[PDB]
């Protein structure tokens, strides 16, 4: 469809003191395999990330306009941005086009800059925010993400069990759907330092 043209899926999950976020590496037009290097999860500040899924032009465009507004914001105020501020900012950015709405699925995963508090949120394409304490999923297929995540996620996890959890969720979530696949990258961040890995995904 419109959103499923380029395909793709983004998943973020809150750990104990940390937060995990992951997405597939694949790019392409419909059933055609194009390139597996494509980047979706983008850094904003430190100890905070953001994912995007949908049209790659809207992905890149939103990342650019967003990074613009953030740079002005933090240039004017020496503090780093808070996650809520970023949330309502992206919501404002998506509602600015009502009758000309972009096509994306913003997923924000980042810690509080003041404390270490973990935080996740996901929005609607016209700017409707949503916050959950377990995980926020956006992408092509439902039963895969919601299914495996509801079937797995636990309240308090070390970074390892969190890692393997979102890993199996993204693997078995991808392996049923053809438009998403071709490698998966996982970003797992904490207050102290950021850790990133690359899952081994079937290239089928």
């Amino acid at each position: 469809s419109i959103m499923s043209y380029n395909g793709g899926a983004v998943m973020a999950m809150k750990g104990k003191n940390c937060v995990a976020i992951a997405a597939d590496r694949r790019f392409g037009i419909q059933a055609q395999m194009v390139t597996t290097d494509f980047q979706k999860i983008f850094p904003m500040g430190d100890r905070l990330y953001i994912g995007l899924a949908g049209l790659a032009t809207d992905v890149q465009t939103v990342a650019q306009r967003l990074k613009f507004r953030l740079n002005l914001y933090e240039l004017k105020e020496g503090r780093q941005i808070k996650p809520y501020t970023l949330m309502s900012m992206v919501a404002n950015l998506l509602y600015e086009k009502r009758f000309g709405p972009y096509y994306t699925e913003p997923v924000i995963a980042g810690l509080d800059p003041k404390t270490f508090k973990p935080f996740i949120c996901s929005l609607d394409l016209i700017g409707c925010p949503m916050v959950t304490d377990d995980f926020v999923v956006s992408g092509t297929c439902a039963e895969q993400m919601y299914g495996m995540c509801e079937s797995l996620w636990e309240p308090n996890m070390d970074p390892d069990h969190l890692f393997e959890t979102i890993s199996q969720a993204m693997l078995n979530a991808v392996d049923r759907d053809a438009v998403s696949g071709m490698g998966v990258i996982v970003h797992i961040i904490e207050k102290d330092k950021i850790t990133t890995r690359t899952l081994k995904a079937r290239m089928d």
Partner: peptide, 11 residues
């Protein structure tokens, strides 16, 4: 309206 948050004195 932008940030849904009280504006800082400095700003």
């Amino acid at each position: 309206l932008v940030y849904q948050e009280p504006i800082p004195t400095a700003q």
